[PDB]
Amino acid sequence: TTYSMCTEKFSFAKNPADTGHGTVVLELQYTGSDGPCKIPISIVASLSDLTPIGRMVTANPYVASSEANAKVLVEMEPPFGDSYIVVGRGDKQINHHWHKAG
């Protein structure tokens, strides 16, 4: 019954884009075949401190299928200032910088 965290690398199929509402939407593509699995995704202040900040709007998203290369749409709310969207862990981690004004 239970699904664990996805173990493989993701890519940004669509880079984060401002929604006009203080959030960003992005699309992920997954390279692994261990789906369904939970996407390791968060917003962090920097790559050296992965303490989660910001706020996920699309919380707890999943890769839905054992099929490779399917897309998952995620909305998230960065904190004011500079942050990084990080997907995956360790040598599978990808990241995208984000700057939010106010």
Distance from chain centroid for Cα 9: 11
- The tally of domains found in the chain comes to 1
β-strands 71-77, 55-56 pairing: antiparallel
What resolution, expressed in A, was reported for this entry?
Answer: 1.7
Residue range of the domain that includes 47: 1-102
Cα dist from 76 to 13, 53, 72, 83, 96, whole Å? 16, 11, 13, 12, 13
Q: Name the experimental technique.
A: X-ray
Q: What are the φ/ψ torsions at residue 91 (nearest 5 degrees)?
A: -75, 0
Asked if 13 contacts 25 with a C-beta cutoff of 8 angstroms, the reply is no
